[PDB]
Target: Fosfomycin resistance protein
Amino acid sequence: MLSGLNHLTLAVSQLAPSVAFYQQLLGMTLHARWDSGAYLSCGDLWLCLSLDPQRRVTPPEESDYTHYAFSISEADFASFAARLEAAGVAVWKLNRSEGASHYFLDPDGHKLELHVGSLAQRLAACREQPYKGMVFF
Amino acid sequence: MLSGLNHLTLAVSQLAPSVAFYQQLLGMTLHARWDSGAYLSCGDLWLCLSLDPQRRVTPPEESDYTHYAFSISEADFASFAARLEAAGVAVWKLNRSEGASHYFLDPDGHKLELHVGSLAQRLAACREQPYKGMVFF
Ligand SMILES: *Sc1ncccc1C(=N)N
Ligand SMILES: [Mn+2]
Ligand SMILES: [Mn+2]
Model:
């Protein structure tokens, strides 16, 4: 029986700028770094950065919608999004925001998101404004 | 401040086989589906499948090391891996690292993993035999 996410591993092209991004800019906790990777945490999330020469810096128009969203509180959302824009972080665009969300890219073009709200909250909101063809179980 | 992972979204090329894989084969809970996506949960993981015409069915040799690991207990690991092998799920790597891991592909070539063990367990193993260049914080 699967019980949740154990870890998320991102391939990165250059280790030092990626550690800097996740630790200095996003505030994650750095536990360990070595010649080919790093271990960070963000609450319960175990994040591994893995140096991979096969990682390409990929423009958002030519990668698919696979993305990783991090939780932030309603009180902190706007000020955190503002700090990312002030730091020059690149954005990516989608037809429609998933509620209160900010979409941004990491140095290698991984698609990230800040989002306020849980699954239960999204289900309740979607009952009032459903996607086309939506069915609830 | 970020508090954890909010959700993981995977781009899929065909919704029905992806729902069958995550719900029926992997045992995740299906909460809602619509014409272009689905919401599932796996413990405290919120997984979104999003139908994306940009998604290519990608061979493992053509994608990088980015991958997503799910938690499972040691007691359940072998029988779960046997289930995947009976269903014909492809393996993209052999484990050679701390602890039990099984590395398998989704129908679109997303790289998945079953892993037993926590970050703390990994850090303790690394303190005993640190990787090349390893520094702890
Ligand atoms: S599912 C949903 N919930 C709340 C607001 C908008 C939407 C939507 N895009 N249908
Ligand atoms: Mn999202
Ligand atoms: Mn892994």
In short: The radius of gyration of chain A is 16 Å. The domain at 1-137 of chain A is CATH 3.10.180.10 (2,3-Dihydroxybiphenyl 1,2-Dioxygenase; domain 1). Chain A touches chain B through 66 residues (CB under 8 Å).
